[PDB]
Design an enzyme around this catalytic site. Structure first.
Site, mmCIF file in Angstrom:
data_model
loop_
_atom_site.group_PDB
_atom_site.id
_atom_site.type_symbol
_atom_site.label_atom_id
_atom_site.label_comp_id
_atom_site.label_asym_id
_atom_site.label_seq_id
_atom_site.Cartn_x
_atom_site.Cartn_y
_atom_site.Cartn_z
ATOM 1 N N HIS A 129 0.820 -1.237 0.000
ATOM 2 C CA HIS A 129 0.000 0.000 0.000
ATOM 3 C C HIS A 129 0.843 1.271 0.000
ATOM 4 O O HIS A 129 0.812 2.080 0.935
ATOM 5 C CB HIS A 129 -1.040 -0.008 1.133
ATOM 6 C CG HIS A 129 -2.106 -1.039 0.939
ATOM 7 N ND1 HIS A 129 -2.049 -2.279 1.542
ATOM 8 C CD2 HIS A 129 -3.205 -1.058 0.145
ATOM 9 C CE1 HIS A 129 -3.097 -2.997 1.172
ATOM 10 N NE2 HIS A 129 -3.811 -2.282 0.319
ATOM 11 N N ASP B 284 -8.473 -0.509 -7.976
ATOM 12 C CA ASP B 284 -7.768 -0.870 -6.754
ATOM 13 C C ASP B 284 -7.190 -2.300 -6.843
ATOM 14 O O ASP B 284 -6.071 -2.547 -6.389
ATOM 15 C CB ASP B 284 -8.686 -0.719 -5.527
ATOM 16 C CG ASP B 284 -7.896 -0.543 -4.212
ATOM 17 O OD1 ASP B 284 -6.655 -0.348 -4.254
ATOM 18 O OD2 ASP B 284 -8.514 -0.588 -3.135
HETATM 19 MG MG LIG Z 1 -7.022 1.086 0.510
HETATM 20 ZN ZN LIG Z 2 -5.466 0.761 -2.767
#
Ligand SMILES: [Mg+2]
Ligand SMILES: [Zn+2]
Ligand SMILES: c1ccc2nc(COc3ccc(-c4n[nH]cc4-c4ccncc4)cc3)ccc2c1
Length: 305
Positions: free
Chosen positions: A63, A212
């Site tokens: 991340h 994502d």
């Molecule tokens: Mg996230």
């Molecule tokens: Zn993400």
């Protein structure tokens, strides 16, 4: 200025942004310019903003800053292949949302923050990290010389920030299941109405999930290597769970690592394939994402055989 290979390959859904970190900001600016125009943002303000965003991503395994630009690229590819569907304001907002959507991520899930009793869980009980990511976005925008939206009216400013907020919150994978369920029902009954703001918000939510998760839409060598980074975070979280005195779920338990192929199968079946299938139904030009996802599913099946 962008290399010829990048100018060509950036248009592919399965583009990978490469190991050269200093090139990523220019890659993002290029994508902004192509979707939004070179007059969209003042270049100096935009550059300042991007560099402060980078600064507030952490050096975690997955991340991180590389993830942020990768998610933004997937959004660029969707928008480029769905010309005329999304407004100038939506396109600007969504690209900026993707860049900012994991700001100040620690490499821990919402569930861990809750179990830890982290101060952020007290502030934001649901979608904890995502509410934080949006808060970080606003804070950066509020820094001297960082307001890339300064040329918008007050109303458009409020509008774009709301687009950004909704998009960032949608990256809470907990929300995806309900969102996808609603969209699938709308699709099958023919009730999906892109001129209805509430429906529009759902479609954008699904796009945010699609972007994502886009590591599962790359070519196998990229996908396989990326899996190393996601599990590096998950296993670290599993260790931390053990240290709290709580047995982690198998996905986070390094002792269960031999079961990664079966876990991947479960994820593709329950989340990834349904996601890209629904996205392709609504936006047919996004089919390459689904194709690549199915290919990676087959690769995991092959690992198992
Ligand atoms: Mg996230
Ligand atoms: Zn993400
Ligand atoms: C033993 C060993 C492994 C196991 N794995 C699972 C499911 O594993 C994942 C891994 C990543 C993700 C993920 N969530 N959000 C983006 C990703 C992702 C990013 C990059 N590549 C793949 C997935 C979702 C599920 C379940 C049980 C298991 C038991």
């Amino acid at each position: 200025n962008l290399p010829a290979r990048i100018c060509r390959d950036i248009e592919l859904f399965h583009f990978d942004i490469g190991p050269f970190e200093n090139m990523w900001p220019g890659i993002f600016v290029y994508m902004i310019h192509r979707s939004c125009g070179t007059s969209c943002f003042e270049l100096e303000k935009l550059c300042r903003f991007i560099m402060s965003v980078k600064k507030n991503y952490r050096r975690v395994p997955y991340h991180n800053w590389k993830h942020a630009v990768t998610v933004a690229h997937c959004m660029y590819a969707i928008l480029q292949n769905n010309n005329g569907l999304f407004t100038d304001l939506e396109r600007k907002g969504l690209l900026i949302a993707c860049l900012c959507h994991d700001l100040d991520h620690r490499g821990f899930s919402n569930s861990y923050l809750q179990k830890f009793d982290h101060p952020l869980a007290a502030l934001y009980s649901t979608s904890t990290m995502e509410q934080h990511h949006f808060s970080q976005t606003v804070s950066i925008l509020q820094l001297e010389g960082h307001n890339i939206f300064s040329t918008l009216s007050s109303s458009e400013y409020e509008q774009v920030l709301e687009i950004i907020r909704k998009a960032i919150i949608a990256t809470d994978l907990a929300l995806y299941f309900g969102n996808r369920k609603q969209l699938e029902e709308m699709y099958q009954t023919g009730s999906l109405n892109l001129h209805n703001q509430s429906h529009r918000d759902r479609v954008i939510g699904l796009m945010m999930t699609a972007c994502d998760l886009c590591s599962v839409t790359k070519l196998w060598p990229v996908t396989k290597l990326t899996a190393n980074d996601i599990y590096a975070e998950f296993w670290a979280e599993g260790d931390e769970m053990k240290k709290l005195g709580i047995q982690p779920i198998p996905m986070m338990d390094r002792d269960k690592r031999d079961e990664v192929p079966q876990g991947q199968l479960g994820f593709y079946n329950a989340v990834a394939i349904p996601c890209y299938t629904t996205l392709t139904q609504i936006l047919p030009p996004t089919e390459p994402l689904l194709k690549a996802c199915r290919d990676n599913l087959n690769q995991w099946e092959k690992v198992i055989r």
